[PDB]
Amino acid sequence: DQQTMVYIVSAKRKIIADRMLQELDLGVTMLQAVGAYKNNETEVIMCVMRKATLVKVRNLLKEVDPDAFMIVS
Amino acid sequence: DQQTMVYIVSAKRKIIADRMLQELDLGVTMLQAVGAYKNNETEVIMCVMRKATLVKVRNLLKEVDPDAFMIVS
């Protein structure tokens, strides 16, 4: 429906980020998250997308990281 | 110090959420993430706050869960 901003957390984010671009034509930006410490980098995938692209992405997650999850802003 | 929305990812989130309320009087919502599967729940702390507060919270993270991190919308 209306476009929502999504953060995806995952150990396998580089791989899910590539497949999102390859197979879904999605433009994502790799955000750097504020850890408890500045040394402790953890990056999050950010992607703005229609409420219906989300399902396609969810199913992509199932295939790559069952432990990944998304924050829907 | 513009009020900004924050997500805190941590395994020890219940402890973090309580100390945020007790010692910083911060009001937080325990948001639920969209995982790859829905049986696989993961909870996120949501909190709107000024940047000064973010520094106090960050220091609280160090104190509880070093692996925790924050997404600043």
mmCIF file with all atom_site columns, C-alpha atoms in Angstrom:
data_model
loop_
_atom_site.group_PDB
_atom_site.id
_atom_site.type_symbol
_atom_site.label_atom_id
_atom_site.label_alt_id
_atom_site.label_comp_id
_atom_site.label_asym_id
_atom_site.label_entity_id
_atom_site.label_seq_id
_atom_site.pdbx_PDB_ins_code
_atom_site.Cartn_x
_atom_site.Cartn_y
_atom_site.Cartn_z
_atom_site.occupancy
_atom_site.B_iso_or_equiv
_atom_site.pdbx_formal_charge
_atom_site.auth_seq_id
_atom_site.auth_comp_id
_atom_site.auth_asym_id
_atom_site.auth_atom_id
_atom_site.pdbx_PDB_model_num
ATOM 1   C CA . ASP A 1 1  ? 0.000  0.000   0.000  1.00 0.00 ? 1  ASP A CA 1
ATOM 2   C CA . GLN A 1 2  ? 1.594  3.142   1.372  1.00 0.00 ? 2  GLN A CA 1
ATOM 3   C CA . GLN A 1 3  ? 5.379  2.989   1.465  1.00 0.00 ? 3  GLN A CA 1
ATOM 4   C CA . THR A 1 4  ? 6.945  2.148   4.858  1.00 0.00 ? 4  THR A CA 1
ATOM 5   C CA . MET A 1 5  ? 10.537 2.351   6.115  1.00 0.00 ? 5  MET A CA 1
ATOM 6   C CA . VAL A 1 6  ? 12.017 -0.974  7.093  1.00 0.00 ? 6  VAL A CA 1
ATOM 7   C CA . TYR A 1 7  ? 15.018 -2.107  9.026  1.00 0.00 ? 7  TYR A CA 1
ATOM 8   C CA . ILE A 1 8  ? 16.194 -5.652  8.621  1.00 0.00 ? 8  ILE A CA 1
ATOM 9   C CA . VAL A 1 9  ? 18.491 -7.178  11.206 1.00 0.00 ? 9  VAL A CA 1
ATOM 10  C CA . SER A 1 10 ? 20.516 -10.206 10.205 1.00 0.00 ? 10 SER A CA 1
ATOM 11  C CA . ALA A 1 11 ? 23.910 -11.874 10.429 1.00 0.00 ? 11 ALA A CA 1
ATOM 12  C CA . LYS A 1 12 ? 23.502 -12.688 6.730  1.00 0.00 ? 12 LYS A CA 1
ATOM 13  C CA . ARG A 1 13 ? 22.585 -9.171  5.673  1.00 0.00 ? 13 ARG A CA 1
ATOM 14  C CA . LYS A 1 14 ? 25.099 -8.830  2.785  1.00 0.00 ? 14 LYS A CA 1
ATOM 15  C CA . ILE A 1 15 ? 23.559 -11.879 1.178  1.00 0.00 ? 15 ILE A CA 1
ATOM 16  C CA . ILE A 1 16 ? 19.967 -10.786 1.793  1.00 0.00 ? 16 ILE A CA 1
ATOM 17  C CA . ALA A 1 17 ? 20.867 -7.281  0.628  1.00 0.00 ? 17 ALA A CA 1
ATOM 18  C CA . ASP A 1 18 ? 22.237 -8.605  -2.674 1.00 0.00 ? 18 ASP A CA 1
ATOM 19  C CA . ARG A 1 19 ? 19.278 -10.858 -3.377 1.00 0.00 ? 19 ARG A CA 1
ATOM 20  C CA . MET A 1 20 ? 16.942 -7.930  -2.592 1.00 0.00 ? 20 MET A CA 1
ATOM 21  C CA . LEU A 1 21 ? 18.689 -5.913  -5.287 1.00 0.00 ? 21 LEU A CA 1
ATOM 22  C CA . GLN A 1 22 ? 19.054 -8.766  -7.781 1.00 0.00 ? 22 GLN A CA 1
ATOM 23  C CA . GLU A 1 23 ? 15.656 -10.449 -7.564 1.00 0.00 ? 23 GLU A CA 1
ATOM 24  C CA . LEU A 1 24 ? 13.452 -7.657  -6.264 1.00 0.00 ? 24 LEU A CA 1
ATOM 25  C CA . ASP A 1 25 ? 15.063 -4.618  -7.879 1.00 0.00 ? 25 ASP A CA 1
ATOM 26  C CA . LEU A 1 26 ? 15.043 -2.963  -4.485 1.00 0.00 ? 26 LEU A CA 1
ATOM 27  C CA . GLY A 1 27 ? 17.185 -0.011  -3.515 1.00 0.00 ? 27 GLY A CA 1
ATOM 28  C CA . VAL A 1 28 ? 18.504 -0.513  -0.008 1.00 0.00 ? 28 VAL A CA 1
ATOM 29  C CA . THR A 1 29 ? 21.007 1.467   2.001  1.00 0.00 ? 29 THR A CA 1
ATOM 30  C CA . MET A 1 30 ? 23.260 -0.151  4.611  1.00 0.00 ? 30 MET A CA 1
ATOM 31  C CA . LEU A 1 31 ? 22.794 1.772   7.907  1.00 0.00 ? 31 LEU A CA 1
ATOM 32  C CA . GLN A 1 32 ? 25.355 1.636   10.695 1.00 0.00 ? 32 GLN A CA 1
ATOM 33  C CA . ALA A 1 33 ? 23.716 1.104   14.079 1.00 0.00 ? 33 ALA A CA 1
ATOM 34  C CA . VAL A 1 34 ? 24.748 2.795   17.352 1.00 0.00 ? 34 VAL A CA 1
ATOM 35  C CA . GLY A 1 35 ? 26.079 -0.042  19.506 1.00 0.00 ? 35 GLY A CA 1
ATOM 36  C CA . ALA A 1 36 ? 26.654 0.103   23.240 1.00 0.00 ? 36 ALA A CA 1
ATOM 37  C CA . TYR A 1 37 ? 30.282 0.756   22.126 1.00 0.00 ? 37 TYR A CA 1
ATOM 38  C CA . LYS A 1 38 ? 31.600 2.526   19.036 1.00 0.00 ? 38 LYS A CA 1
ATOM 39  C CA . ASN A 1 39 ? 33.995 -0.362  18.150 1.00 0.00 ? 39 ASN A CA 1
ATOM 40  C CA . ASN A 1 40 ? 31.069 -2.793  18.004 1.00 0.00 ? 40 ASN A CA 1
ATOM 41  C CA . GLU A 1 41 ? 29.816 -2.213  14.475 1.00 0.00 ? 41 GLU A CA 1
ATOM 42  C CA . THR A 1 42 ? 26.560 -3.832  13.524 1.00 0.00 ? 42 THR A CA 1
ATOM 43  C CA . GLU A 1 43 ? 24.906 -2.793  10.311 1.00 0.00 ? 43 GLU A CA 1
ATOM 44  C CA . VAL A 1 44 ? 21.261 -2.865  9.479  1.00 0.00 ? 44 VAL A CA 1
ATOM 45  C CA . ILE A 1 45 ? 19.567 -2.943  6.070  1.00 0.00 ? 45 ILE A CA 1
ATOM 46  C CA . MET A 1 46 ? 17.261 0.000   5.519  1.00 0.00 ? 46 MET A CA 1
ATOM 47  C CA . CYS A 1 47 ? 14.684 -0.117  2.804  1.00 0.00 ? 47 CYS A CA 1
ATOM 48  C CA . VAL A 1 48 ? 11.672 1.967   1.952  1.00 0.00 ? 48 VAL A CA 1
ATOM 49  C CA . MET A 1 49 ? 8.980  -0.197  0.362  1.00 0.00 ? 49 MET A CA 1
ATOM 50  C CA . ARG A 1 50 ? 5.281  -0.722  -0.397 1.00 0.00 ? 50 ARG A CA 1
ATOM 51  C CA . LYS A 1 51 ? 3.420  -2.773  2.191  1.00 0.00 ? 51 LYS A CA 1
ATOM 52  C CA . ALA A 1 52 ? 3.193  -5.595  -0.392 1.00 0.00 ? 52 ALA A CA 1
ATOM 53  C CA . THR A 1 53 ? 6.875  -5.842  -1.247 1.00 0.00 ? 53 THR A CA 1
ATOM 54  C CA . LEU A 1 54 ? 7.267  -6.818  2.395  1.00 0.00 ? 54 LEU A CA 1
ATOM 55  C CA . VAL A 1 55 ? 5.884  -10.319 1.897  1.00 0.00 ? 55 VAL A CA 1
ATOM 56  C CA . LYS A 1 56 ? 8.304  -11.007 -0.917 1.00 0.00 ? 56 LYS A CA 1
ATOM 57  C CA . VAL A 1 57 ? 11.106 -9.908  1.382  1.00 0.00 ? 57 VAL A CA 1
ATOM 58  C CA . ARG A 1 58 ? 9.854  -11.880 4.327  1.00 0.00 ? 58 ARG A CA 1
ATOM 59  C CA . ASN A 1 59 ? 9.975  -14.992 2.139  1.00 0.00 ? 59 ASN A CA 1
ATOM 60  C CA . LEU A 1 60 ? 13.444 -14.118 1.082  1.00 0.00 ? 60 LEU A CA 1
ATOM 61  C CA . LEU A 1 61 ? 14.369 -14.076 4.769  1.00 0.00 ? 61 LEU A CA 1
ATOM 62  C CA . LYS A 1 62 ? 13.005 -17.574 5.322  1.00 0.00 ? 62 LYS A CA 1
ATOM 63  C CA . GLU A 1 63 ? 15.483 -18.781 2.701  1.00 0.00 ? 63 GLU A CA 1
ATOM 64  C CA . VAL A 1 64 ? 18.542 -17.061 4.066  1.00 0.00 ? 64 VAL A CA 1
ATOM 65  C CA . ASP A 1 65 ? 18.250 -16.332 7.792  1.00 0.00 ? 65 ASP A CA 1
ATOM 66  C CA . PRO A 1 66 ? 15.333 -17.811 9.788  1.00 0.00 ? 66 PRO A CA 1
ATOM 67  C CA . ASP A 1 67 ? 16.561 -15.619 12.627 1.00 0.00 ? 67 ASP A CA 1
ATOM 68  C CA . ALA A 1 68 ? 16.430 -12.358 10.711 1.00 0.00 ? 68 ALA A CA 1
ATOM 69  C CA . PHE A 1 69 ? 13.663 -9.940  11.568 1.00 0.00 ? 69 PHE A CA 1
ATOM 70  C CA . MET A 1 70 ? 12.452 -6.553  10.437 1.00 0.00 ? 70 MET A CA 1
ATOM 71  C CA . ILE A 1 71 ? 11.405 -3.390  12.119 1.00 0.00 ? 71 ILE A CA 1
ATOM 72  C CA . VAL A 1 72 ? 8.514  -1.768  10.326 1.00 0.00 ? 72 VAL A CA 1
ATOM 73  C CA . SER A 1 73 ? 8.563  1.998   11.055 1.00 0.00 ? 73 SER A CA 1
ATOM 74  C CA . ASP B 1 1  ? 18.424 17.877  20.650 1.00 0.00 ? 1  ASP B CA 1
ATOM 75  C CA . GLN B 1 2  ? 15.413 17.262  18.415 1.00 0.00 ? 2  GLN B CA 1
ATOM 76  C CA . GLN B 1 3  ? 13.208 14.459  19.733 1.00 0.00 ? 3  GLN B CA 1
ATOM 77  C CA . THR B 1 4  ? 14.091 11.337  17.695 1.00 0.00 ? 4  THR B CA 1
ATOM 78  C CA . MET B 1 5  ? 12.697 7.751   17.589 1.00 0.00 ? 5  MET B CA 1
ATOM 79  C CA . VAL B 1 6  ? 14.905 4.872   18.723 1.00 0.00 ? 6  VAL B CA 1
ATOM 80  C CA . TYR B 1 7  ? 14.917 1.112   18.542 1.00 0.00 ? 7  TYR B CA 1
ATOM 81  C CA . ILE B 1 8  ? 17.054 -0.880  20.908 1.00 0.00 ? 8  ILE B CA 1
ATOM 82  C CA . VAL B 1 9  ? 17.948 -4.428  19.981 1.00 0.00 ? 9  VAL B CA 1
ATOM 83  C CA . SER B 1 10 ? 19.048 -6.570  22.890 1.00 0.00 ? 10 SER B CA 1
ATOM 84  C CA . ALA B 1 11 ? 18.661 -10.052 24.303 1.00 0.00 ? 11 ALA B CA 1
ATOM 85  C CA . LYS B 1 12 ? 18.616 -8.456  27.778 1.00 0.00 ? 12 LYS B CA 1
ATOM 86  C CA . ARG B 1 13 ? 15.919 -5.963  26.750 1.00 0.00 ? 13 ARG B CA 1
ATOM 87  C CA . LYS B 1 14 ? 13.521 -6.516  29.691 1.00 0.00 ? 14 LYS B CA 1
ATOM 88  C CA . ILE B 1 15 ? 16.288 -5.555  32.121 1.00 0.00 ? 15 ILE B CA 1
ATOM 89  C CA . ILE B 1 16 ? 17.259 -2.574  29.945 1.00 0.00 ? 16 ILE B CA 1
ATOM 90  C CA . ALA B 1 17 ? 13.661 -1.416  29.624 1.00 0.00 ? 17 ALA B CA 1
ATOM 91  C CA . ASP B 1 18 ? 13.149 -1.523  33.391 1.00 0.00 ? 18 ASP B CA 1
ATOM 92  C CA . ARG B 1 19 ? 16.292 0.455   34.208 1.00 0.00 ? 19 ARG B CA 1
ATOM 93  C CA . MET B 1 20 ? 15.367 2.978   31.522 1.00 0.00 ? 20 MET B CA 1
ATOM 94  C CA . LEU B 1 21 ? 12.086 3.550   33.342 1.00 0.00 ? 21 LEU B CA 1
ATOM 95  C CA . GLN B 1 22 ? 13.453 3.509   36.868 1.00 0.00 ? 22 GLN B CA 1
ATOM 96  C CA . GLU B 1 23 ? 16.609 5.533   36.517 1.00 0.00 ? 23 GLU B CA 1
ATOM 97  C CA . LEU B 1 24 ? 15.827 7.754   33.521 1.00 0.00 ? 24 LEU B CA 1
ATOM 98  C CA . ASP B 1 25 ? 12.010 7.933   33.790 1.00 0.00 ? 25 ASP B CA 1
ATOM 99  C CA . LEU B 1 26 ? 11.820 7.152   30.096 1.00 0.00 ? 26 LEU B CA 1
ATOM 100 C CA . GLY B 1 27 ? 8.587  5.882   28.644 1.00 0.00 ? 27 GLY B CA 1
ATOM 101 C CA . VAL B 1 28 ? 9.095  2.975   26.291 1.00 0.00 ? 28 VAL B CA 1
ATOM 102 C CA . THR B 1 29 ? 6.924  0.675   24.195 1.00 0.00 ? 29 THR B CA 1
ATOM 103 C CA . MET B 1 30 ? 7.836  -2.955  23.760 1.00 0.00 ? 30 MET B CA 1
ATOM 104 C CA . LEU B 1 31 ? 7.419  -3.291  19.992 1.00 0.00 ? 31 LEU B CA 1
ATOM 105 C CA . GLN B 1 32 ? 7.308  -6.643  18.201 1.00 0.00 ? 32 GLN B CA 1
ATOM 106 C CA . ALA B 1 33 ? 9.395  -7.261  15.078 1.00 0.00 ? 33 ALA B CA 1
ATOM 107 C CA . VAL B 1 34 ? 8.297  -8.986  11.882 1.00 0.00 ? 34 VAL B CA 1
ATOM 108 C CA . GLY B 1 35 ? 10.539 -12.027 11.814 1.00 0.00 ? 35 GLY B CA 1
ATOM 109 C CA . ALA B 1 36 ? 11.126 -14.374 8.882  1.00 0.00 ? 36 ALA B CA 1
ATOM 110 C CA . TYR B 1 37 ? 8.422  -16.595 10.492 1.00 0.00 ? 37 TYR B CA 1
ATOM 111 C CA . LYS B 1 38 ? 5.785  -15.434 12.955 1.00 0.00 ? 38 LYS B CA 1
ATOM 112 C CA . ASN B 1 39 ? 6.335  -18.215 15.545 1.00 0.00 ? 39 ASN B CA 1
ATOM 113 C CA . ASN B 1 40 ? 9.768  -16.660 15.865 1.00 0.00 ? 40 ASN B CA 1
ATOM 114 C CA . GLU B 1 41 ? 8.961  -13.578 17.959 1.00 0.00 ? 41 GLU B CA 1
ATOM 115 C CA . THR B 1 42 ? 11.612 -10.998 18.746 1.00 0.00 ? 42 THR B CA 1
ATOM 116 C CA . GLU B 1 43 ? 10.872 -7.851  20.722 1.00 0.00 ? 43 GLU B CA 1
ATOM 117 C CA . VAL B 1 44 ? 12.354 -4.447  20.273 1.00 0.00 ? 44 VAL B CA 1
ATOM 118 C CA . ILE B 1 45 ? 12.356 -1.466  22.662 1.00 0.00 ? 45 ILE B CA 1
ATOM 119 C CA . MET B 1 46 ? 10.937 1.679   21.071 1.00 0.00 ? 46 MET B CA 1
ATOM 120 C CA . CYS B 1 47 ? 11.570 5.036   22.674 1.00 0.00 ? 47 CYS B CA 1
ATOM 121 C CA . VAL B 1 48 ? 11.309 8.638   21.527 1.00 0.00 ? 48 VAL B CA 1
ATOM 122 C CA . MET B 1 49 ? 13.937 10.829  23.104 1.00 0.00 ? 49 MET B CA 1
ATOM 123 C CA . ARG B 1 50 ? 16.355 13.731  22.743 1.00 0.00 ? 50 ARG B CA 1
ATOM 124 C CA . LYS B 1 51 ? 20.034 13.113  21.812 1.00 0.00 ? 51 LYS B CA 1
ATOM 125 C CA . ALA B 1 52 ? 21.295 13.912  25.331 1.00 0.00 ? 52 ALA B CA 1
ATOM 126 C CA . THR B 1 53 ? 19.144 11.102  26.661 1.00 0.00 ? 53 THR B CA 1
ATOM 127 C CA . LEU B 1 54 ? 20.648 8.817   23.986 1.00 0.00 ? 54 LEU B CA 1
ATOM 128 C CA . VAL B 1 55 ? 24.035 9.152   25.621 1.00 0.00 ? 55 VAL B CA 1
ATOM 129 C CA . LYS B 1 56 ? 22.705 8.153   29.024 1.00 0.00 ? 56 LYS B CA 1
ATOM 130 C CA . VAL B 1 57 ? 20.962 5.160   27.461 1.00 0.00 ? 57 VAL B CA 1
ATOM 131 C CA . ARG B 1 58 ? 24.062 4.118   25.595 1.00 0.00 ? 58 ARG B CA 1
ATOM 132 C CA . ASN B 1 59 ? 25.969 4.062   28.884 1.00 0.00 ? 59 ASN B CA 1
ATOM 133 C CA . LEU B 1 60 ? 23.270 1.954   30.371 1.00 0.00 ? 60 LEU B CA 1
ATOM 134 C CA . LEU B 1 61 ? 23.759 -0.521  27.539 1.00 0.00 ? 61 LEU B CA 1
ATOM 135 C CA . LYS B 1 62 ? 27.440 -0.874  28.318 1.00 0.00 ? 62 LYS B CA 1
ATOM 136 C CA . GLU B 1 63 ? 26.305 -1.737  31.802 1.00 0.00 ? 63 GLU B CA 1
ATOM 137 C CA . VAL B 1 64 ? 23.876 -4.502  30.842 1.00 0.00 ? 64 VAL B CA 1
ATOM 138 C CA . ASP B 1 65 ? 24.406 -5.849  27.344 1.00 0.00 ? 65 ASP B CA 1
ATOM 139 C CA . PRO B 1 66 ? 27.589 -4.914  25.413 1.00 0.00 ? 66 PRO B CA 1
ATOM 140 C CA . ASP B 1 67 ? 26.138 -6.499  22.284 1.00 0.00 ? 67 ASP B CA 1
ATOM 141 C CA . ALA B 1 68 ? 22.982 -4.426  22.357 1.00 0.00 ? 68 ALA B CA 1
ATOM 142 C CA . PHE B 1 69 ? 22.591 -1.708  19.769 1.00 0.00 ? 69 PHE B CA 1
ATOM 143 C CA . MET B 1 70 ? 20.246 1.071   18.719 1.00 0.00 ? 70 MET B CA 1
ATOM 144 C CA . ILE B 1 71 ? 18.645 2.128   15.502 1.00 0.00 ? 71 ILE B CA 1
ATOM 145 C CA . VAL B 1 72 ? 18.143 5.873   15.346 1.00 0.00 ? 72 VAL B CA 1
ATOM 146 C CA . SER B 1 73 ? 15.333 6.626   12.856 1.00 0.00 ? 73 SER B CA 1
#
